[PDB]
Design a protein around this ligand. Structure first.
Ligand SMILES: CCCCCCCC/C=C/CCCCCCCC(=O)O[C@H](COC(=O)CCCCCCCCCCCCCCC)COP(=O)(O)OC[C@@H](O)CO
Ligand SMILES: *[C@@H]1O[C@H](CO)[C@@H](O)[C@H](O)[C@H]1NC(C)=O
Ligand SMILES: *[C@@H]1O[C@H](CO)[C@@H](O)[C@H](O)[C@H]1NC(C)=O
Ligand SMILES: *[C@@H]1O[C@H](CO)[C@@H](O)[C@H](O)[C@H]1NC(C)=O
Ligand SMILES: *[C@@H]1O[C@H](CO)[C@@H](O)[C@H](O)[C@H]1NC(C)=O
Ligand SMILES: *[C@@H]1O[C@H](CO)[C@@H](O)[C@H](O)[C@H]1NC(C)=O
Ligand SMILES: *[C@@H]1O[C@H](CO)[C@@H](O)[C@H](O)[C@H]1NC(C)=O
Lengths: 97, 49, 463, 475, 474
């Protein structure tokens, strides 16, 4: 049964992951247009309700010539998990099972 | 770089110890023939240009 | 029918992305990080070890003012715009009431800073302007909203000079007569620099607060205002992108106005309709403050010639910060608006239907969740609100709890502050948040998905 | 809908507003910074100009002697007879007091085999095995045991044990020179022997600007195995409440709260006389009973805490003695805890009234019908949690320091879910059965236990929604 | 029914076990080992250096530590008076130092390279050990002593498992003589390129409480170069019967032995009379597992407590090194066995929590979904091990967290918790670095974590539905 469901819920999972890609891109755009404003004080809400992917718990801020592709994917993917956006997959899988 | 080589690298090569080097070292340079005018020190520049 | 809107929105999103990349690698803020270390991260003098960020006494403040402060102001190398200004706020003796029980041992008594209990009388040698009270209007000042209070724009001000020796002598004179008495509550030091080698403008404001108990609390604010100029075709290309983004908004607003002459109020039922107005107002506010910035950059750029007047420019950094926040939020919202358009297939259709059908129950459980969240926040504020420094104020408690939800606990100060009722709060919060409360949104979403799928399957089979 | 529910609602909001005003008035700002500056002055200051050691990082008795003659005297006495102002605002009240608790030699039973080579044994601290005899130059209160009653003391509940209020005490002076001479004479004669088990330092300040006393207590524990364990306590109090008009407003609010509590008490007692006798089958009634009990306890604590302020009057009569402000601080802490608990409960009581539409009613019914299954599964979840905690306590209970105590094990296990642990120290403490515990715990905690909770919630919500939909549809 | 008898007996057994575990896990002896470790591990090797034992780098650092922080922490000043480390901890006898080395010529080099290099030393092995005198051959520090003559045993260090033999020296009771001995060892070079391991051993008593402490510090010199330090502080109790609580613990231990004998008899009788299958229950396999573990623990305790002859030998001559390593090893083994046994005894409580309709259906759901959970967990673990082997083969030489296979497994389990550093993994490989992390997180939190939920929810739903329908239609 298991693999069958994995090959039977593929279109819905692809739609959900497309939505997740859009949301993660939006967050990464939002989460780097205000960490670029590093200086020494970003904001109140944006400093608490923000997610950075594991590693460097205390942010070093100021991504000077170091905003490479890999950290953006890292932070977007990890922010997608913390907020429980990935658990939405269960909503599909359970029904299929 | 020259003090670092004087204090670290040279004692590591000729300073007989375990795991011998098996071959002399070498330094290789490219000139670029296009001597660059440097930006004044301070804020960083985007990688290289 | 819907293709033209899609292509216009795609062009708009491409333009917005090119502007977003334009204001992302300008290296305007690493500049201020570099100059933050010049003033903040520097020992007060040769023999001392503490810097501005770790000030703990009034004498440290005096040593810093005539020490490290007089280094950055008078030579990387920068140019001083006009002269720097330093001012204080102070309260009057007797502003509070000593209890009769022990009035025979304590004579002097001061209060927490407030407008109702603010000093307005001259003190010391009444020669200069630092010993006379000047009103807020006469100073062109405004509130600051500091750490422990909100300070008005009035006080006892003294603008410094252009040469290092004159300012050093003047602050030495300010030292000879006691100018920071026990009545002072806050002190401001603000100025601006030029930095000829790279066209960057910096506005600097440093604040030192003296609480009613003792010690000092330092704070800083550096803002790099930038002046727009075209040298290559790349920044001229960015200007062209700015103007095309400018008159995309005109098309959007005229299209908005044209379609409202038919519908009276039916425009507010649709969620996607009430997002266009938010986008429009937010973008027009951003572009308005941006165009106001340039009208103030003028005259400012010619201020470095021989001016001995204080460059009053604190009204611009606040709007710069607001512009940054507005740009970030509008980028997020336009990306969400792009997220709207994906309804091509039937799977995306049923996902959108599920979300639209479950939004209301999501809002209701959000209300319940916020009630419980506020209950825990108040409990944490009342328990740990005086030792931990993460629960010092109510908003700090709320933000700390939100950070705890995302896994950022400390648990050392919480344990030390209360060995019992400290661990209980943390354990109960974690248990009831990560096992019960946050598992109720997903139940609603799952049930809505099941009902939507069943309804679609039943309705498609019959027709 | 009716008049009764509206009256209950308006009464509950009036009570909530009164309690919110009461809690806001006793939690003013600028009180955190008072204690923070006090701690920074007394804890973080190095014991000497040539050493990096402070109170928080004490390591031996010589470091303690350096601190007592060093940063303590520097931070206690400020110059400007005469009086001392700490930050030119905080007035030092009376004199500080030092106290020592020690055990007696011969409180052990050395094994016969090793008896020939070891002659001295001192037990860990206990009331039944504590010294009560003079020692050294017995010509003062520092070399003579003073009973708990004669010292007006009480227990402390430190880190290792719960110490008594008695011991050998010395009252210091008002000026720095006399206190320094006293400490020098107290150190030249060996006052801290191998039998010393605990040391206390106590004092207080006023800070007349605001009306807020501060009581400072520093404790140093000497375990029987050697070493030093420091701890501190800074506590702000208010003993001269009625000064400004806001204090009168707070007193009026307290009286209004007392009237509200009396009304709730009389309503609940009148309800259970014959009508609905033994009515504990409803959750809201039990919640109301709990709130009433907590409020009555808080009121009783408050009544018998502001009445016994005689110590303040005695100190004000003669300001050359030691002010005793420890019972007041203890009862203030207890009152704060009770107030926080009761305000949390009265806040979560708000769910009785949020049923204004069908969505909130459905959510309330779903939460109501989840309680039984959730409790049933929580029993098993906590059984497994306690089994893992006991295993971790037995395995890592002596090396890691995050599993050094059973409750510490429970808290560390709760933190593991949050993923803020090290795993290097626990892996180096046991190369086998250490990583096994971690991996097995993570697997059985994220894959088998959370999903069961969410499955129960999902099934209950679906059943409740179907039942409610069938109800109105059939109607 | 008859469950009441079993419940009462199990409750008594659990109470006895909890009393025994509380007795063995005594009052705060954490601070004992904490003070000892912080005295010996965290102290810098010199007043000018910043390095300690935990961060040793080379052999000269080891020599500085030996005549340094070690001598400062060992001998405390207060005819040749003894040393009290904290004025409470008594240093028993003298400490002992030992060295394990390989021989020159245990190593083959290519014949075309035998012109510039002459000496290479193999990695440590029993076959390539050095058993010949070297240097100024005078005493036991320059003469090989067999493992049997040293009363030693293997250790199983980090790099390899080391023998109980080598070249050893017994230090003195005073600081001056030990310093002279160490200086003599250093002057006539004792740690050359052939050395592979160094051990330092001693013990203390701390007569206040009744608890010996055994300290062993090991330093490994791998063939590739470098230094790897490790430590071990172990508390023991060898004079048990002193106070009344000791007699109470002995009585509890005897009661535990009686309970174990009763359980063994019941198990044998109830498997012999009938129920020859006996293993399709999972409540009879747990019983035999508990019995086996408890019998192993009892045997270990009996064999260990009778071998206290080393204490008697030391107490009649207190100028020699006391051998307490075997007792520490067996104490660690006993602690592990007891912890596992008590964990399983606590787990056994699930057999009795069935007393209302709510608690029965949860057990039924778990028992019904166990098969499907195992079936999917097989595939989940196969995919997990595929990820682990890929990570080990790719990042296993540069990251310090994928150097061993089990370390890769633990690293992935920590990645699930989010306790990882993404910076280190990407700089080891610009490509295939981010890909690994991204695909791992995605396929682990979006797919594998949700199939478990699907299975569990379906099983619970069907169980509750059928139970309610058959109960309400009867
Ligand atoms: C502003 C317009 C749109 C803004 C869009 C921005 C939204 C930003 C991303 C959201 C995620 C997508 C929906 C996810 C909700 C559905 C799934 C879900 O909620 O998961 C559960 C709760 O998780 C959670 O934290 C839940 C956090 C809150 C998300 C639930 C939705 C709240 C919406 C309330 C009003 C909506 C209607 C009004 C909008 C106009 C369990 O999680 P999990 O076990 O894995 O615990 C892991 C632990 O580390 C995190 O707590
Ligand atoms: C402050 O005012 C009080 C009011 O009585 C007075 O007694 C005292 O002398 C004043 N102190 C100073 C600093 O002048
Ligand atoms: C205050 O602002 C006014 C209006 O620009 C200006 O004339 C004046 O110089 C400012 N303050 C002073 C120096 O009086
Ligand atoms: C301590 O007690 C022992 C045994 O009771 C006794 O021999 C000794 O004299 C006492 N005093 C000292 C200082 O050891
Ligand atoms: C304890 O309180 C009584 C109350 O009058 C007082 O006389 C006595 O001095 C206090 N004890 C000490 C040690 O001061
Ligand atoms: C080590 O052995 C080699 C022969 O394998 C020999 O040439 C060399 O002298 C030896 N090194 C010494 C004597 O330390
Ligand atoms: C090994 O133990 C025996 C006692 O059985 C003892 O005589 C001998 O000295 C020990 N070995 C060493 C190296 O001390």
């Amino acid at each position: 049964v298991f693999g069958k469901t994995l090959c039977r819920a593929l279109p819905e999972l692809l739609g959900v992951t497309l939505g997740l890609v859009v949301l993660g891109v939006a967050y990464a755009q939002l989460a780097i247009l205000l960490v670029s404003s590093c200086v020494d004080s970003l904001w109140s809400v944006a400093q608490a309700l923000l997610v950075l992917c594991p590693g460097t718990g205390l942010s070093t801020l100021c991504p000077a010539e170091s905003w490479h592709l890999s950290p953006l994917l890292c932070v977007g993917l990890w922010a997608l998990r913390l907020w429980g956006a990935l658990r939405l997959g269960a909503v599909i899988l359970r029904w299929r099972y | 770089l020259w003090p670092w080589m004087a204090h670290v690298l040279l004692p590591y090569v000729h300073g007989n110890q375990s795991s011998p080097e098996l071959g002399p070292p070498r330094l290789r340079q490219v000139r670029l023939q296009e001597a660059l005018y440097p930006d004044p020190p301070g804020p960083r520049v985007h990688t290289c240009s | 029918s819907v293709l033209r809107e899609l292509v216009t929105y795609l062009l708009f999103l491409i333009v917005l992305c090119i502007l977003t990349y334009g204001m992302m690698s300008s290296n305007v803020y690493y500049y201020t990080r570099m100059m933050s270390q010049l003033f903040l991260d520097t020992p007060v003098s040769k023999t001392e070890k503490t810097n501005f960020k770790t000030l703990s006494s009034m004498e440290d403040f005096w040593k810093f003012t005539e020490g490290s402060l007089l280094d950055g102001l008078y030579w990387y190398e920068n140019l001083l715009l006009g002269v720097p200004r330093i001012r204080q706020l102070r309260v009057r003796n007797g502003s509070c009431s000593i209890p009769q029980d022990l009035r025979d041992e304590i004579k002097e008594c001061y209060d927490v800073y407030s407008v109702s209990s603010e000093d307005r009388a001259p003190f010391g040698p009444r020669n200069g302007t630092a010993w006379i009270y000047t009103s807020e209007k006469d100073l062109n000042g405004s509130s600051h909203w500091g750490i422990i209070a909100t300070y008005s724009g009035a006080g006892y001000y003294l603008d410094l000079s252009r040469t290092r020796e004159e300012t050093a002598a003047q602050v030495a004179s300010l030292k000879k007569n006691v100018w920071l008495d026990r009545g002072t509550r806050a002190t401001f030091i603000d100025f601006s620099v030029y930095n000829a080698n790279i066209n960057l403008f910096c506005v600097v404001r440093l604040l030192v607060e003296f609480p009613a108990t003792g010690g000092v609390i330092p704070s800083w604010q550096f803002q790099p205002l930038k002046l727009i100029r075209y040298v290559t075709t790349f920044d001229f290309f960015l200007a062209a992108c700015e103007i095309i983004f400018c008159f995309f908004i005109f098309y959007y607003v005229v299209e908005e106005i044209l379609e409202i002459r038919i519908h009276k109020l039916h425009y507010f039922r649709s969620f996607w309709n009430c997002l266009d107005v938010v986008i429009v107002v937010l973008s027009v506010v951003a572009i308005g403050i941006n165009i106001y910035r340039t009208s103030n950059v003028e005259v400012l750029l010619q201020f470095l010639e021989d001016q001995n007047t204080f460059p009053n420019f604190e009204h611009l950094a606040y709007w710069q910060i607001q512009f940054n926040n507005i740009a970030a939020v509008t980028v997020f919202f336009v990306w969400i608006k792009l997220f709207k358009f994906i309804n091509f297939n039937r799977t995306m259709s049923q996902l959108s239907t599920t979300m639209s059908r479950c939004a209301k129950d999501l809002f209701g459980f959000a209300i319940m969740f916020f009630i419980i969240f506020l209950a825990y926040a108040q409990l944490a504020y009342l328990v740990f609100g005086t030792q931990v420094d993460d629960f010092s104020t109510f908003q700090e408690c709320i933000f700390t709890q939100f950070r705890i939800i995302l896994g950022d606990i400390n648990f050392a100060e919480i344990e030390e502050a209360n060995r019992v009722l400290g661990p209980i709060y943390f354990t109960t919060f974690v248990f009831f948040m990560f096992f019960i409360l946050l598992n109720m949104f997903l139940a609603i979403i799952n049930d809505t998905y099941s009902e939507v799928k069943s309804d679609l399957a039943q309705q498609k089979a019959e027709m």
